[PDB]
Structure formats: structure tokens, C-alpha cells
Ligand binder design. Structure first.
Ligand SMILES: CC(C)c1nnc2c(C(=O)NCCc3nc(-c4ccccc4)cn3C)cccn12
Ligand SMILES: [Mg+2]
Ligand SMILES: [Zn+2]
Length: 313
């Protein structure tokens, strides 16, 4: 009832900032997330015994892969917490509840392979889900864990609020398929610029929540340079393992995934900052002005990759 979560002073202050790193102590990630739900939503959004049991079943269903792991899940939820606290009054009680859970669950049971590799391997999940393969699997696993005895954190919601929140989570999670991002942002751009963008239109909200999810998912590019640089080793370690597996199938992987082409990482990160990250955080700042720090930090790390290419580090 009267049981707050508190953090040490440095975390209490730094958790409010977009660039916050959740640190190397795994056993504090759960308390960090609960802290965020309580400040974002209220101490009464979720029955604490159910929330805790949900958090630990979710953790157990992330795998020990280099990048798409439990640490990524809590990183992406933290970024969503930063967005929600800097845009307090633009979001319903249900959106606040659904979106933090959506981020924690958004890569459940990820095996460290692209939708592409599932399809070329002919993995069962590719027959069951022809597009957004892993992301439909991630949502599926969220519903599984919600249905476990003592895990329904949404038990108090009305029959209809329950369906609305699971629909918020489904779209939120589908949106983390980067193939769907390019379309979603082009439309969000055109709607903002012609002035058609309207946040009372539910299909316009959907698109905005979609872009928030891509922002939160990419937030490793908005960290202090040494966090951004080291995280890149993790994500390339998956990409190269996939490359190896593509070669095992008799297929030349794209350069991104070919560990023979390590040399070209800086140029590839440049490409990705220009094609993906900068556009994302640009359009997000236009739509939601207080998210500007994500854009500014992204721009800083781009400049840090330009420096790497010029032999200046
Ligand atoms: C940490 C998080 C935020 C993160 N980082 N990257 C990503 C990507 C992604 O598409 N990355 C690859 C960028 C890239 N590399 C090459 C390359 C490299 C070496 C040799 C040759 C070509 C090419 N291109 C385009 C997707 C989702 C989250 N990501
Ligand atoms: Mg994913
Ligand atoms: Zn992710």
C-alpha cells in the first residue's frame, strides 16, 4: 500500500534524463522498472505482487544473446518513461500503463536473428507469421505471460479497457518492425507539414505511438558516446553470427552481417544515422517538442562516428 520504491540519489536524478544508462547490476533492473511505472502511472496502476511476478516471467523469457536481451528491454522501457514524463498531459491512463509494458515485452524470446534469417532458414515462426515474424511472436509471448496464474497485472481493468490496452500493446510491438518504420514516418511527416495531423484521430495516435516505439527501440544511439560505442559491439556480434548462419545456408550475407567486413562499421553506422535514426528523432521532435534531447544526443554520436572515420579516434 504505502510502499514507494526509491533509488540512490545519482539514479533518482539521472533516471529522469533521456541519456540515462541502467548500469551493469542486473538485480536492480526490476526495481528500476517498478520505480518508473510508479512515477509514470501511480502506485495503484498494478497490484505489486502481480507486477513483480510478471517482470520476473518476462525476464526469464529473454535469452542470453549479446544485444536483444533483458537489458535492452529495460533500456527501451526507460526511454519510453523519459518520453511520457516530458509529455505528461498528452497521454491517457491506459496508454501510460500499456506502453511501458509494451517496451519491456517488445523483444520477448528473441533469438538474435532478423525476420530475414527466420524466412531463409524456413523456421516454423516464418510459416505461422509471414510479415513482422519476430514481432508477432513477441506479442504472442506477452499474451502467454499475462495468462499465467497470478500474472494478470490488468485484472482490475473493465472487459473493454482490457481489450483497448492489449490492442495498444499489439500495435506498439508490431511497430518495432523497422520495415514498417519508413512508411510510418513518411506519413507522419506529410501529416505534420500539411497540418492534417490530429491527436484525437485514433489512427493518428497509432502512428505517433509507432514512432515513439522506434525512437525507444533505437535509444542506444542517444546515449553518452562510450555507451553508444560499446552497445554497437553487442549489436554487430548478433549481425555477424547471423552472417555466419547465412553462409552455412550457402548464401552471401549483406555486408552489415559479414564479419570479414568489420573495417566498414563506421561508414555503416553513418548510413544508419542518416537513413534511420536522425529522420526518426527529427520527426519525433516536430510532433513532440520536449523529446529534442534524443535528437541532439543522436546528432552528437553521428559526429562521434564521423570522427572515427577520420582517424581522430
Ligand atoms: C544499437 C541499436 C540502436 C542499433 N544499431 N544498429 C542498429 C540497426 C542497424 O541496421 N545497424 C547496422 C547499420 C549498418 N551497418 C552497415 C555495415 C557495417 C559493417 C560493414 C559494412 C556495412 C551497413 N549498415 C546500414 C537496426 C536496429 C537497431 N540498431
Ligand atoms: Mg525487435
Ligand atoms: Zn528492440
Amino acid at each position: 500500500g504505502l510502499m514507494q520504491f526509491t533509488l540512490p540519489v545519482r539514479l533518482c536524478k539521472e533516471i529522469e534524463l533521456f541519456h540515462f544508462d541502467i548500469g551493469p547490476f542486473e538485480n536492480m533492473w526490476p526495481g528500476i522498472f517498478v520505480y518508473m511505472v510508479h512515477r509514470s502511472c501511480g502506485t495503484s496502476c498494478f497490484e505489486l505482487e502481480k507486477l513483480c511476478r510478471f517482470i520476473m516471467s518476462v525476464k526469464k523469457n529473454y535469452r542470453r544473446v549479446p544485444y536483444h536481451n533483458w537489458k535492452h528491454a529495460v533500456t527501451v522501457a526507460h526511454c519510453m518513461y523519459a518520453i511520457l514524463q516530458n509529455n505528461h498531459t498528452l497521454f491517457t491512463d491506459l496508454e501510460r500503463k500499456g506502453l511501458l509494458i509494451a517496451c519491456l515485452c517488445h523483444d520477448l524470446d528473441h533469438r538474435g536473428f532478423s525476420n530475414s534469417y527466420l524466412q531463409k532458414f524456413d523456421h516454423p515462426l516464418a510459416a505461422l507469421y509471414s510479415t513482422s515474424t519476430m514481432e508477432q511472436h513477441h506479442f504472442s509471448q506477452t499474451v502467454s505471460i499475462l495468462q499465467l496464474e497470478g500474472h494478470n497485472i490488468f485484472s482490475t481493468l473493465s472487459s473493454s479497457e482490457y481489450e483497448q490496452v492489449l490492442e495498444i500493446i499489439r500495435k506498439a510491438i508490431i511497430a518495432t518492425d523497422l520495415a514498417l518504420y519508413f512508411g510510418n514516418r513518411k506519413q507522419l511527416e506529410e501529416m505534420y507539414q500539411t497540418g492534417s495531423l490530429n491527436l484525437n484521430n485514433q489512427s493518428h495516435r497509432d502512428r505517433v505511438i509507432g514512432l515513439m516505439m522506434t525512437a525507444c527501440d533505437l535509444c542506444s544511439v542517444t546515449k553518452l558516446w562510450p555507451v553508444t560505442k560499446l552497445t554497437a559491439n553487442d549489436i554487430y556480434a548478433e549481425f555477424w553470427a547471423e552472417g555466419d548462419e547465412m553462409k552455412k545456408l550457402g548464401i552471401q550475407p549483406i555486408p552489415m552481417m559479414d564479419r570479414d567486413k568489420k573495417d566498414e562499421v563506421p561508414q555503416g553506422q553513418l548510413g544508419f544515422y542518416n537513413a534511420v535514426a536522425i529522420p526518426c528523432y527529427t520527426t519525433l521532435t516536430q510532433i513532440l517538442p520536449p523529446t529534442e534531447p534524443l535528437l541532439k544526443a543522436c546528432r552528437d554520436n553521428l559526429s562521434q562516428w564521423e570522427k572515427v572515420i577520420r582517424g581522430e579516434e
